[PDB]
Write a structure and sequence with these properties.
part of a larger assembly; 3 chains; 31% helix; L-fucokinase/L-fucose-1-P guanylyltransferase (chain A); transferase; ATP
């Protein structure tokens, strides 16, 4: 039911940075002052939610960070600093395998899918992820850091998804604003059935 | 209104406890009772169940008192204060 | 010749962070305004060097960044974002290679 334009929202990602450039996105966490839970479906669908919250840095740093850079090989490399892991995504099938056993990379996979590297979200039809990345100009290397573990109550998972989405937005010239980034985050978490 | 803000934060904590009995384990309640007299209010961020405790001290002196109390009476070797500051930037992105 | 206390400068590293903590260090680059090259051996050894320079962030970010975190396994993992690489150091011999 929650799927809205989650199937037909097409993007055209284009390499918008120079070959030796690295995109750094970063976000603080949040503390909800009031109205938490009222944004949770289906109650939010019944009557709408009200939430007062604010963004906060912890120990003078943004706890959510993402680096995106071009890759010589026409695949996607995903690295996790907090989980200390790495994974290579070469096909559309691998990119959309969100529930892969032992993989901590469901969030960046869903984010890259929403950015147009999965066929359902791409305006242009591509034969394979490798061909789409060859037309793109390079592969993509995404390094992620959630300095605060998920389940801490500070919004780690959603804000990390948004940070990946914003970094990919800048890296691919999708021209999303912050509101659209948050809406794409909602779509992402619906893809992951959070 | 700072006082009303702190009191309403406390009320949010009460509402969250009423929605979820597991959000306030007895150890968190003991930590709270250690310093509850120096706050206008407090709550756990998000779904709670433990983790981080947000406290609104009555005044800077009360905040110093809270820090001293929780430092001299740590509930476990891992507990620690985390400095929080309001972010005037939100999500930022830049290029090398 | 340049080795001074480069052999006998002993340290005692101790895990000073909590188990779930990550250390983030970051630095800007620099622009040397004057006196560059005068700090280069052996001329700096002949007469000493004078350099005026300053630290600068580029596009509002510190270009040099490092993350350090505890590891469940008793080895050293090294990852490079700009080079896109990873390496496992398990022995003194590997660390000094």
């Amino acid at each position: 039911g929650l799927l809205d334009g989650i199937s037909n929202r097409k993007s055209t990602p284009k390499l918008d940075v120079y070959s030796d450039q690295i995109v750094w996105g970063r976000s603080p966490v949040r503390i909800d002052m009031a109205g938490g839970w009222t944004d949770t479906p289906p109650y939010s669908l019944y009557s709408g939610g009200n939430v007062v919250n604010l963004a906060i840095e912890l120990n003078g740093q943004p706890p959510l960070q993402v680096y995106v850079k071009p890759c010589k090989d026409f695949h996607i490399v995903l690295r996790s600093i907090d989980m200390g892991a790495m994974e290579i995504v070469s096909t559309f099938d691998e990119l959309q395998d969100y529930k892969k056993i032992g993989s901590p990379f469901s969030i960046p996979k869903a984010a890259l899918s929403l950015a147009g590297f999965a066929p359902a979200f791409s305006a242009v039809s591509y034969a394979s992820l490798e061909e789409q990345l060859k037309d793109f100009g390079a592969g993509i290397e995404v390094t992620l850091l959630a300095a605060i573990p998920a389940g801490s109550g500070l919004g780690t998972s959603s804000i990390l998804a948004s940070t990946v989405l914003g970094a990919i937005n800048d890296f691919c010239g999708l021209a999303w604003d912050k509101n659209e980034i948050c809406q794409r985050t909602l779509v992402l978490e619906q893809l992951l059935t959070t | 209104s700072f006082v009303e803000f702190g009191r309403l934060v406390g009320k949010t904590w009460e509402q969250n406890k009423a929605l979820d009995s597991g959000t306030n384990p007895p150890a968190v309640e003991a930590i709270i009772d250690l310093i509850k007299d120096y706050t206008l209010g407090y709550k756990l961020p998000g779904a709670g169940g433990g983790g981080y405790l947000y406290m609104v001290a009555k005044d800077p002196q009360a905040a110093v008192r809270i820090r001293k109390i929780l430092t001299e009476n740590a509930p476990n070797p891992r507990a620690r204060f985390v400095e929080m500051t309001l972010s005037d930037k939100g999500f930022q992105v830049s290029r090398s």
